[PDB]
Amino acid sequence: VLDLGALGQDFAADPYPTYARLRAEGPAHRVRTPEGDEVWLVVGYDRARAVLADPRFSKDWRNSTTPLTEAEAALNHNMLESDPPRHTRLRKLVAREFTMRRVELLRPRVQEIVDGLVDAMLAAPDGRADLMESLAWPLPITVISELLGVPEPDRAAFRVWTDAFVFPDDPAQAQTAMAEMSGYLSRLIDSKRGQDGEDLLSALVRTSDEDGSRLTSEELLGMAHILLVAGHETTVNLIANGMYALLSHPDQLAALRADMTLLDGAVEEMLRYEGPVESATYRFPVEPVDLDGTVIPAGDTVLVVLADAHRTPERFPDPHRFDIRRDTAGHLAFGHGIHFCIGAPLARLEARIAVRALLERCPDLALDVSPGELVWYPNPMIRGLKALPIRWR
Ligand code: HEM
Numbered sequence: 001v002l003d004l005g006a007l008g009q010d011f012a013a014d015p016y017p018t019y020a021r022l023r024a025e026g027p028a029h030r031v032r033t034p035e036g037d038e039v040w041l042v043v044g045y046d047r048a049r050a051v052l053a054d055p056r057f058s059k060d061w062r063n064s065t066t067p068l069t070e071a072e073a074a075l076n077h078n079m080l081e082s083d084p085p086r087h088t089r090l091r092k093l094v095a096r097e098f099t100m101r102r103v104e105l106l107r108p109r110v111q112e113i114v115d116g117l118v119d120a121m122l123a124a125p126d127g128r129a130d131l132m133e134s135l136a137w138p139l140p141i142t143v144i145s146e147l148l149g150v151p152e153p154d155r156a157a158f159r160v161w162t163d164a165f166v167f168p169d170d171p172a173q174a175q176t177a178m179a180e181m182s183g184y185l186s187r188l189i190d191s192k193r194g195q196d197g198e199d200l201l202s203a204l205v206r207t208s209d210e211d212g213s214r215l216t217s218e219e220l221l222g223m224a225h226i227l228l229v230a231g232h233e234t235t236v237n238l239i240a241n242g243m244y245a246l247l248s249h250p251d252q253l254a255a256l257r258a259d260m261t262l263l264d265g266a267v268e269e270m271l272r273y274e275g276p277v278e279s280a281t282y283r284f285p286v287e288p289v290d291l292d293g294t295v296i297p298a299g300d301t302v303l304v305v306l307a308d309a310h311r312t313p314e315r316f317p318d319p320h321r322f323d324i325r326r327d328t329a330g331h332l333a334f335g336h337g338i339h340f341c342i343g344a345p346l347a348r349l350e351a352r353i354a355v356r357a358l359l360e361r362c363p364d365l366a367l368d369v370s371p372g373e374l375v376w377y378p379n380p381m382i383r384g385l386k387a388l389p390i391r392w393r
């Protein structure tokens with residue numbers, strides 16, 4: 001057991017060395033994370049990539065000796081927290097809507113907005129702004145709302161909840177926050193019902209209404225949840241981490257400056273260097289697994305430490321180097337195997353459109369700050385700044 005709350009923000013800020021340390025000793029290690037939780041950590045690209053889609057590791061709480069709370073299980077009815085089948089019926093209901101193709105239509109809007117967002121920000125006399133409260137957050141929370149059909153006056157309560165889940169002032173807010181969403185969202189599910197809305201949510205109400213055997217009132221809720229969430233506190237951070245990455249390394253930022261074709265590649269490398277997902281989501285071996293000696297026993301929670309997998313000197317030699325030339329082919333910033341991210345299509349869309357914006361409508365764009373002044377979330381699942389200021393001139 002290696003405590004993580006005790007390691008400090010230092011770990012948060014730069015936990016890569018520890019990951020190194022860990023991998024060098026073995027594939028798996030039981031550790032305590034910042035919130036009293038005593039979990040497992042899988043490290044190393046080779047060992048991790050395997051785990052992610054290894055049958056033996058379940059994502060269904062029933063294969064977990066760790067109990068859920070009313071707040072919890074009232075929402076775990078999502079494709080992501082289900083194993084096959086089920087995860088087959090659920091994901092096979094939104095698939096057709098998140099394909100690279102379909103998704104591309106959303107573009108003009110993931111355009112219309114990334115400009116409006118950029119405009120208010122450019123309304124800084126001083127020249128300074130915290131990209132986080134300007135782009136990063138705003139963007140992701142708009143597109144999805146305008147998709148799962150989320151009223152404007154409520155797109156705020158969400159940033160409120162997402163926070164408490166990420167790193168709550170105290171491991172209690174989250175349990176209350178879950179109630180809210182679980183409630184605001186159920187109340188939302190009704191507004192739709194009856195109306196003739198065309199958004200994805202409305203679209204998911206007629207499916208439960210018609211045949212609740214295809215989608216349950218619970219899975220509908222589950223669904224609505226995992227879609228809003230599982231892509232809000234991930235996109236936002238890729239955005240920020242992406243800017244802190246591209247702003248810190250001038251050789252590249254200048255490269256991508258003159259040439260803007262390295263954009264589609266800039267993003268893929270902003271996910272290999274430091275993507276928003278520090279570690280995969282909870283996995284439970286249905287039966288005791290044997291990762292060469294280290295034996296995680298039944299029901300135990302597991303986390304694939306992506307951030308380390310993504311820094312394997314054997315697949316990304318010179319790991320700690322951020323080269324938008326680098327061959328990002330092989331990164332697991334989106335997961336792998338059946339549970340792979342159903343949003344990579346949508347995600348990238350927003351990202352690339354964004355960097356282009358900020359780089360094309362922000363002259364002397366630069367870090368209006370120093371590393372020593374950053375602040376990263378302690379959670380070992382995420383990896384993002386609490387805020388990130390910039391200046392343009
Ligand atoms: C760029 C930001 C994003 C990142 C880094 C990301 C990454 C991932 C990863 C790693 C998983 C793997 C889960 C696991 O195996 O533990 C996942 C699953 C998923 N993500 Fe994302 N995601 C992003 C954006 C999106 C967006 C915009 C949506 C919006 C709907 C989305 C919805 C979900 C859902 C619902 C799954 C379920 C996959 C399944 O069980 O079939 N993701 N994501």
Ligand SMILES: CC[C@H]1OC(=O)[C@H](C)[C@@H](O[C@H]2O[C@@H](C)C[C@@H](N(C)C)[C@@H]2O)[C@@H](C)C[C@H](C)C(=O)/C=C/[C@H]1C
Nearest residue numbers: 072073075076165166229230233234277279281381
């Ligand atoms: C998609 C990558 C991010 O993962 C999430 O969105 C995870 C799945 C999400 O987990 C929990 O969300 C609750 C609202 C419901 C709960 N379940 C028990 C009913 C589910 O496990 C995040 C909100 C949790 C973590 C802290 C996070 O912020 C994001 C992590 C990414 C890896």
